């Protein structure tokens, strides 16, 4: 629908993937203005 049609949803399931890092987030809100989900900002390498 958005870009890949696979992780566009799946990173909202395990939250461990994030291709575009929630980006589309259509599984939650319209874009990502409300509450998007990203670990990649704090889970960089493991610090």
Could you explain the architecture of this structure?
This protein is mostly loops and 47 residues long. The protein has one helix spanning 7-10. It has one domain (1-47). 9% of the residues lie in helices and 0% in strands. It starts with 6 loop residues before the first helix and ends in a 37-residue tail after the last helix. Residues 1-47 are cytoplasmic. This is Integrin beta-3. The modification Phosphotyrosine is found at residues 32, 44. Belongs to the integrin beta chain family.
Short overview:
With 47 residues, this protein is mostly loops.
Structural class category: little secondary structure
Order of helices and strands: H
Shape: globular
Please state roughly what percent of the residues sit in beta strands, choosing from under 5%, 5-15%, 15-25%, 25-35%, 35-45% or over 45%.
under 5%
For the CA atoms, what is the radius of gyration? 10 Å
Question: What is the CA–CA distance across the termini?
Answer: 34 Å
Query: Major sheet, described briefly?
Result: none
Number of strands: 0
Name the quaternary structure.
monomer
Question: How many separate domains make up the residues?
Answer: 1
Helices, by number, come to 1
Helix content: under 10%
Modified residues (Phosphotyrosine): 32, 44
Subcellular location: Cell membrane; Cell projection, Lamellipodium membrane; Cell junction, Focal adhesion; Postsynaptic cell membrane
Family: Belongs to the integrin beta chain family.
Modified residues (Phosphothreonine): 26, 38
């Amino acid at each position: 629908k958005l870009l890949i049609t696979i992780h566009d949803r799946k990173e909202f399931a395990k939250f461990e993937e994030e291709r575009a890092r929630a980006k589309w987030d259509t599984a939650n809100n319209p874009l990502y203005k409300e509450a998007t989900s990203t670990f990649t900002n704090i889970t960089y390498r493991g610090t």
